[PDB]
């Protein structure tokens, strides 16, 4: 997934949010699962940065939506982290593992709870997010919401205990 000139260009185009360039690179055979030395792929970058159209293009080309970088981050983690609701929605509709864990034990639900992303929490729950999953520090999404004083978010996760 390295050594290809087009793969490096695809990573750069995703990182820079250059929609047309991503499209043309994929139309001309670029590796949809290209990655850098950290295991970071174009989908990871587009998901973290909020490039929805680029996410959709990569999905159309059969990208591995469950790819993890060397830190255990999946695209769903990163979109939940930075608050990109529409990206969260399209990834889940394409079958991403809703309960994947990074190297700190966080699922995407934990990250959305840290951030207070209410609508993202609701979509993750709709797709089967595990409210009982504990991170490496024993905390559930509910525990996080209580620690951060997010009364709105605790209102939802309370009902599911």
């Amino acid at each position: 997934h390295h050594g290809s000139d087009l793969g490096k260009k695809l990573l750069e185009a995703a990182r820079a949010g250059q929609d047309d360039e991503v499209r043309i690179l994929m139309a001309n055979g670029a590796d949809v699962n290209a990655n850098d030395v950290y295991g970071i792929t174009p989908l990871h970058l587009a998901a973290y940065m909020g490039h929805l159209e680029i996410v959709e293009v990569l999905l159309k080309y059969g990208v591995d939506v469950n790819a993890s970088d060397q830190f255990g981050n999946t695209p769903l983690h990163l979109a939940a982290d930075d608050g990109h609701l529409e990206i969260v929605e399209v990834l889940l509709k394409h079958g991403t593992d809703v309960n994947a864990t990074d190297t700190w034990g966080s699922t995407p639900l934990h990250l959305a709870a840290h951030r207070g992303h209410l609508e993202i929490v609701e979509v993750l729950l709709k797709y089967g997010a595990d409210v009982n999953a504990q991170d490496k520090f024993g905390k559930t999404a509910f525990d996080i919401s209580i620690d951060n004083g997010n009364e709105d978010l605790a209102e939802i996760l309370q009902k599911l205990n």
Binding site: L45, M49, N73
Partner: peptide, 14 residues
């Protein structure tokens, strides 16, 4: 500045 809540975030902004 941004507060990171997961690992490796520095490598997403180079």
């Amino acid at each position: 500045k941004r507060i990171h809540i997961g690992p490796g975030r520095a490598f997403y902004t180079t």
